[PDB]
Design a protein around this ligand. Structure first.
Ligand SMILES: [Dy+3]
Ligand SMILES: [Dy+3]
Ligand SMILES: [Dy+3]
Ligand SMILES: [Dy+3]
Ligand SMILES: [Dy+3]
Ligand SMILES: [Dy+3]
Ligand SMILES: [Dy+3]
Lengths: 110, 110
């Protein structure tokens, strides 16, 4: 998916950008959408192609093999900062289409 | 409620315990249940009696006046650890009934 696609689906206010509240909420929706096994936890197989082993090492600090909702969203907030090249707390289409923005996109859209 | 009543509410027996995945999932449901204004954000008036000013200062690091889901759940994970007096990763009824356990209960049930 592209940045224009994400704005079309996830932006409901009268702007051209995704703010952190919009991004976190879409991350929470996506967590459930990519979790087909009927639990409340993401296992490593469920996160392939969206998260790296380094993301798990950084965010999963509780000794389990499960990403709970908060550990997933922690990674997303870090990725938001990396994509927000002009520091204004808003992700525009150009920021979403950048390499760092692609990392946000894979956590906010199935 | 009490620890026993909280365990019963989550379809568990009186001598059972809560682990972090069930607690985080219940915290995520509670976030939305205590948020009656149609947004995706908890304002301070929505968290009175559940969170302190110091909780907001620790968890709300983004310069806004709003708790997103990840900031709320960060506080819950901190409270789980404080209520887990023996640090075994499980909260018994007695741990839930403690003063620190009360702080978990106000975040996992309306
Ligand atoms: Dy917006
Ligand atoms: Dy799963
Ligand atoms: Dy975990
Ligand atoms: Dy920006
Ligand atoms: Dy609200
Ligand atoms: Dy915030
Ligand atoms: Dy314990």
């Amino acid at each position: 998916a592209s940045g224009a696609d994400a704005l079309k689906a996830l932006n409901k206010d009268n702007d051209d950008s995704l703010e952190i509240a919009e991004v976190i909420h879409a991350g929470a929706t996506t967590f459930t959408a990519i979790n087909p096994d009927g639990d409340t936890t993401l296992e490593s197989g469920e996160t392939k192609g969206r998260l790296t082993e380094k993301d798990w090492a950084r965010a999963n600090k509780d000794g389990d093999q499960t990403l709970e909702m908060d550990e997933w969203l922690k990674i997303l907030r870090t990725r938001f900062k990396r994509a927000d090249a002009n520091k204004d707390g808003k992700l525009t289409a150009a920021e979403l289409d950048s390499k760092a923005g692609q990392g946000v996109l894979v956590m906010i859209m199935k």
